[PDB]
């Protein structure tokens, strides 16, 4: 069995590269961040432009939703993150502290905390209610490419060009584990599986890997695509069949069978690097976004 994703909508509006797309937890919206300094909100089902959210002084590399779908947090070249009230489009807090581009961000499931990763080589943990930085982790020795909380918020996983994936205790700030597979290619993305037991990691040698966190062992590798230069988002698709979904530098969305590691679909349409993919939380819907020669977001839908 293989999925049958087909192009449904193309969302045009950003005037520079799109950097990241994410579906709201309640399934109603898609948020996109862009090098054009804007966040845009679109209807998840109809692809309809809802609104533009502005305030950052420079382009934005990542955006993420709170668990109740009411807030967004954005990560910008202007060295700040901003927490936004989605309904009003207003900036509630500006999180200041990083000393170089902020590259990645995420809320914990409780959504009382935000974690951020930066080109300043640190990971920061922020109090959402007060806007205060709780911890500054000296996490890596090169830019931090991804940060993500596990299912109960007790752990944070980070990745870096230094070739490491590290797992941190949210409460104590202690580094609990370092994962590396003998060779040290730059790690460009990392994310916990929905059950918290695995970590999916991308490295800049055209390779994705599924790690068992507890055993600290690589279990599966996914290959065939192109990833040498960019920090591309990958996903666990779980609404239908169990797939791995990723962008690629040859302008395609790749879908692998999680268990067999076989490529099952390659989605054509984008005209530049697909930097970001996202999966709808309840329906078989994928969002993809591409870099500056393309500037569009695409919504793809499937029966399984």
């Amino acid at each position: 069995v293989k999925p049958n994703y087909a192009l449904k909508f193309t969302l045009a509006g950003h005037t520079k590269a799109v950097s990241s797309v994410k579906f709201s937890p309640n399934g109603e919206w898609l948020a996109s961040s862009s090098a054009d300094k804007l966040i845009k909100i679109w209807g998840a089902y109809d692809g309809k432009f809802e609104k533009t959210i502005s305030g950052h002084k420079l382009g934005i590399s990542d955006v993420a939703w709170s668990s109740d779908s009411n807030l967004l947090v954005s990560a910008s070249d202007d060295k700040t993150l901003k927490i936004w009230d989605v309904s009003s489009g207003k900036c509630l807090k500006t999180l200041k502290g990083h000393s170089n581009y902020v590259f990645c961000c995420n809320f914990n499931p409780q959504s009382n905390l935000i974690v951020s990763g930066s080109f300043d080589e640190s990971v920061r943990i922020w109090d959402v209610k007060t806007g205060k930085c709780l911890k500054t982790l000296p996490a890596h020795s090169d830019p931090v490419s991804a940060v993500h909380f596990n299912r109960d918020g007790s752990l944070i996983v980070s990745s870096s060009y230094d070739g490491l994936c590290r797992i941190w205790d949210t409460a104590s700030g202690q580094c609990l584990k370092t994962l590396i597979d003998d060779d040290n290619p730059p790690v460009s993305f990392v994310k916990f599986s929905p059950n918290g037991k695995y970590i999916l990691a991308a490295t800049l040698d055209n390779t994705l890997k599924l790690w068992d966190y507890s055993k600290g062992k690589c279990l599966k590798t996914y290959t065939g695509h192109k990833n040498e230069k960019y920090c591309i988002f990958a996903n666990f698709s779980v609404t239908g069949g169990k797939w791995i979904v990723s962008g690629s530098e040859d302008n395609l969305v790749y879908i692998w069978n999680l268990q067999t590691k076989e490529i099952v679909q390659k989605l054509q349409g984008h005209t530049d690097v697909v930097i970001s993919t996202a999966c709808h939380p309840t329906e078989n819907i994928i969002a993809s976004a591409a870099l500056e020669n393309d500037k569009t977001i695409k919504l793809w839908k499937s029966d399984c």
């Binding site: 590259f103 230069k229 870099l291």
Partner: peptide, 13 residues
Amino acid sequence: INPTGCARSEPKI
């Protein structure tokens, strides 16, 4: 300054 406008949209050299 990143010419494309943000860090993620620049290639790693």
